[PDB]
Write a protein that binds this ligand. Sequence first.
Ligand SMILES: CCCCCCCC/C=C\CCCCCCCC(=O)OC[C@H](O)CO
Ligand SMILES: *C\C=C(C)/C=C/C=C(C)/C=C/C1=C(C)CCCC1(C)C
Ligand SMILES: CCCCCCCC/C=C\CCCCCCCC(=O)O
Ligand SMILES: CCCCCCCC/C=C\CCCCCCCC(=O)O
Ligand SMILES: CCCCCCCC/C=C\CCCCCCCC(=O)O
Ligand SMILES: [Cl-]
Ligand SMILES: [Cl-]
Length: 264
Amino acid sequence: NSMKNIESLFDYSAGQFEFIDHLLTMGVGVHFAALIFFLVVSQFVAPKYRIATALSCIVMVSAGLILNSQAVMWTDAYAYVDGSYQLQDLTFSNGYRYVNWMATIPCLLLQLLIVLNLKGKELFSTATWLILAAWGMIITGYVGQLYEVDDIAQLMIWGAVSTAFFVVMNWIVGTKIFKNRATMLGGTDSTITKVFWLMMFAWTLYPIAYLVPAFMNNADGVVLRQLLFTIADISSKVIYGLMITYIAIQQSAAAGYVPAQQAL
Ligand SMILES: CCCCCCCC/C=C\CCCCCCCC(=O)OC[C@H](O)CO
Ligand SMILES: *C\C=C(C)/C=C/C=C(C)/C=C/C1=C(C)CCCC1(C)C
Ligand SMILES: CCCCCCCC/C=C\CCCCCCCC(=O)O
Ligand SMILES: CCCCCCCC/C=C\CCCCCCCC(=O)O
Ligand SMILES: CCCCCCCC/C=C\CCCCCCCC(=O)O
Ligand SMILES: [Cl-]
Ligand SMILES: [Cl-]
């Protein structure tokens, strides 16, 4: 799929190449640093909500491994020749980001439903529909970006089908949050509403990066998309995880879990 993405179309100045490489490496570092944080604070989370913080560890490592894979594919595919980085081997594509989403998006969705205090029948059915919608969004998007060079019209059609799933997923997420925030302890009924708007903002950056080929088909666009991915990843995975943990700890403390009370 490397020859299908716009990355394969351009030579890169040293500055452009090193910046992209440094974004990807910086990203590996932020995720594995947060992995340790989530690992260590899980002992301060009541059993009720401990899976939520554990799911963040899974998200961090999954995202960190992909970003680490990308950084090495990026340096494997290009060589500095005659004053610019030129494609040598067909080994880089964003398609692996989409495979990190198939597995990480369910994890991110499930930790939200856990701290909303859903359980039993409703948790199982709500997650199934959220995961089906999210996989439909991702799959249709993955097919679309296969055409970001050869057929932009087709990228837009698949993007619109993907956006329909996205809208429906957000309608479910939003409805559940607003119908269940009253059950939330420790005043986290107020915090959960900020998480909803963080998700809305951070998750909507991905379709924007998706569209870069249509409005900035050049080497600066490749840099820009990677920049947006980096901001979207840190906000949708790292910051979102920090807030889910804070909600887990706070509710734990309000529920009589002493380590949480000790920690907070
Ligand atoms: C592909 C082109 C078609 C694009 C179509 C754009 C439609 C925009 C509308 C909603 C977007 C989804 C945003 C969902 C916002 C939260 C919804 C919500 O919270 O629902 C409240 C509930 O009804 C009470 O509790
Ligand atoms: C790493 C975590 C998350 C939640 C990544 C989320 C990505 C999306 C919601 C992507 C959405 C897309 C849409 C709405 C339409 C264009 C294709 C995309 C897959 C980029
Ligand atoms: C075909 C796609 C189907 C997707 C179904 C998978 C979704 C399952 C949802 C919730 C599983 C329950 C996870 C356990 C909750 C934590 C238990 C605990 O806190 O002790
Ligand atoms: C790896 C498990 C993936 C699960 C697949 C089932 C998810 C159902 C979600 C929506 C299906 C959308 C079907 C689009 C197929 C056309 C794309 C193509 O031609 O390859
Ligand atoms: C990711 C969000 C999806 C956005 C869907 C956009 C809806 C369609 C908008 C206008 C379609 C115009 C198609 C013109 C492309 C002609 C092909 C070409 O010459 O490049
Ligand atoms: Cl978490
Ligand atoms: Cl993409």
